[PDB]
């Protein structure tokens with residue numbers, strides 16, 4: 001059977017090709033995860049169909065209904081057979097879905113408009129002139145919501161009650177907000193997205209300070225999926241062949257615009 | 259410009275829409291007070307933003323710190339410009355904030371699990387097999403704390419010393435306690451909430467006896483607010499036009515499940 | 517030559533966000549009758565353009581107090597846009613402040629009901645109170661009822677202006693959703709063009725009833741004294757005569773039919 005793959009439109013993982021309007025199916029997309037999906041499918045021996053997650057979210061569980069949304073939800077409720085995207089491996093998710101060994105490393109980081117007087121998370125917490133927030137329904141927001149570390153705990157207290165809201169629906173929204181806020185808004189996002197954007201015109205943003213944590217993205221399948229085993233071994237093979245590093249350079253630094 | 263409205267997640271006044279995760283701002287909520295807020299804003303000519311009170315409380319002044327919590331606190335300390343919720347008009351509150359004429363009438367009442375051998379407050383006060391309590395923080399608890407009426411004084415003497423605590427953090431907690439206590443717990447709450455729950459599945463609770471008092475909910479604003487006058491006139495207009503009665507029937511009886 | 521700023525409004529099937537295009541850029545994000553019309557007008561007039569969605573999401577009305585114009589009309593009046601290409605109704609109060617091309621589409625105010633609603637005309641609505649009814653805010657339909665001297669419409673306005681809760685809605689989508697969730701207790705007054713479009717969209721539970729209450733048209737608008745006015749007007753006439761407008765109507769209304 002054709003494997004239904006759920007993914008998300010997030011640069012440079014999955015993007016619509018310039019002339020996508022004249023293309024069909026998987027050919028409409030390009031990006032790191034588009035290339036990865038092709039490789040994984042080749043090694044695991046399956047045909048597939050790329051589908052963009054319906055609600056455009058990564059995945060979080062509603063505290064009241066306990067219902068999962070995003071790509072995680074699509075796997076949990078059987079709408080998709082596998083998720084190939086920058087989906088962060090976390091404990092709460094590992095409890096409802098399966099993850100392959102990580103194919104990419106990352107950590108939460110800070111994105112600022114060049115010139116912004118901020119060098120670290122500690123800096124953001126000690127002031128209020130510069131607003132800062134995170135993405136919604138993702139692992140970064142959860143990180144702050146559950147952090148016991150003084151600095152991060154203080155930051156969350158601020159963000160959760162900030163008005164207007166400092167949270168954004170998509171990474172694109174967060175980046176645009178930083179670029180138009182004349183340095184009055186800093187965005188907390190994964191180092192991977194941060195470093196990609198830093199190399200794209202108008203080259204007005206930059207990553208500052210060290211990462212807040214160390215984790216990784218994994219290919220996810222529904223609990224007990226028969227694809228889990230093969231997918232995991234495929235990720236290990238691709239990493240050892242140097243293919244993952246090749247794809248990283250291809251989409252991040254190769255063709256950089258700055 | 260945009261008026262910050264503080265309210266509380268209390269059914270059927272303000273509730274999260276089933277699909278709130280895919281909606282934004284004021285569209286995330288539904289209920290009697292959500293409908294009323296839109297009308298008050300339309301008639302007073304202002305844009306607004308609904309916000310759920312941070313500590314999930316109605317409002318009481320801490321003995322010692324003298325600090326106000328809940329929605330009252332949000333108004334007193336300037337976090338919100340107006341409160342549109344089932345906020346009871348009381349003397350201690352009228353001393354620090356302004357209230358519009360009442361938009362809904364209510365009285366403290368008794369909620370029992372069907373079959374409970376209780377028909378009045380006097381009944382509760384003359385026995386001990388059936389425990390009873392109130393919302394841990396609110397106008398009801400204060401009613402008993404300050405009452406000089408024998409029956410109620412007797413009830414307060416019992417409740418304030420009962421162990422384990424007979425007080426609850428939210429109305430929902432109280433309702434759940436009544437439903438799971440096999441008739442060994444009765445809950446004292448405002449007639450409005452009582453009558454609402456009476457029409458909700460599993461239809462295992464009911465309001466018994468007459469109300470202990472007679473009062474009302476009012477729209478509150480910070481002392482001296484420029485919004486006070488128009489808001490008051492809007493409440494009077496909406497009541498005279500029959501809107502308030504229409505909204506109560508809509509959220510209490512038209513959608514009754516019993 | 518400079519890039520012409522086009523103001524329009526998100527109203528189906530005139531201008532709609534293509535599925536999953538929220539994060540893309542430029543005119544490629546949108547599709548619809550007015551998107552296709554803009555392309556043809558620009559081609560015939562020889563100009564480059566940028567589609568922008570009206571900031572306040574309104575068509576355009578003048579506030580009685582401040583006398584300030586909002587919506588697409590306002591964007592033209594205050595110089596925020598160079599032209600409006602949308603389902604903007606040609607009206608006297610508007611033509612007094614902006615210029616309109618000859619109409620590119622005909623329409624009339626009509627009634628939308630949830631299937632099964634016992635209403636067949638405006639007269640019917642006016643002679644009962646069980647079923648509520650209203651219109652869009654800040655638009656030509658509301659103004660039509662506000663100024664009407666016709667017995668039936670005057671009675672309808674008297675009712676709508678003070679009905680509680682408000683019978684008016686912020687967007688066409690809101691009015692449509694209200695009809696659909698009201699179990700026949702709400703009827704929506706809107707332009708026949710939108711009515712006929714929705715009637716062919718799932719869940720296919722609404723329908724237009726009775727004849728139109730008036731007859732008017734949508735026009736492409738430009739600020740007074742705009743150097744684009746003349747060419748745009750002639751372009752509209754050419755598009756009509758070439759059968760292009762009829763082709764676009766069929767493409768977005770009937771060929772798209774889901775019922």
Ligand SMILES: O=C1c2cc3c(cc2O[C@@H]2CCCN12)OCCO3
Pocket residue numbers: 102103104105106214215216217
């Ligand atoms: O998620 C990850 C991770 C992710 C990763 C690695 C190594 C990793 O090891 C770190 C330390 C513990 C958490 N980490 O190597 C390959 C790329 O992805």
Ligand SMILES: N[C@@H](Cn1oc(=O)[nH]c1=O)C(=O)O
Pocket residue numbers: 058059086087088089135137138139140141171188189190193
């Ligand atoms: N990969 C994250 C999504 N997200 O991307 C960021 O940059 N922050 C954030 O929460 C996830 O899987 O939830």
Ligand SMILES: N[C@@H](Cn1oc(=O)[nH]c1=O)C(=O)O
Pocket residue numbers: 316317344345346393395396397398399429446447448451
């Ligand atoms: N409306 C009350 C809150 N509360 O709801 C009840 O049912 N009891 C009670 O104290 C208040 O404004 O304090």
Ligand SMILES: N[C@@H](Cn1oc(=O)[nH]c1=O)C(=O)O
Pocket residue numbers: 575576603604605606652654655656657658688705706707710
């Ligand atoms: N085209 C109308 C807007 N509107 O759409 C309707 O269906 N009614 C209404 O007022 C306008 O230009 O004001």
Ligand SMILES: [Zn+2]
Pocket residue numbers: 020021534537544
């Ligand atoms: Zn496209």
Ligand SMILES: [Zn+2]
Pocket residue numbers: 039042043243
């Ligand atoms: Zn390979």
Ligand SMILES: [Zn+2]
Pocket residue numbers: 062063064065274278
């Ligand atoms: Zn929820």
Ligand SMILES: [Zn+2]
Pocket residue numbers: 556560755760
């Ligand atoms: Zn042509």
Ligand SMILES: [Zn+2]
Pocket residue numbers: 297300301679680681682
């Ligand atoms: Zn009203």
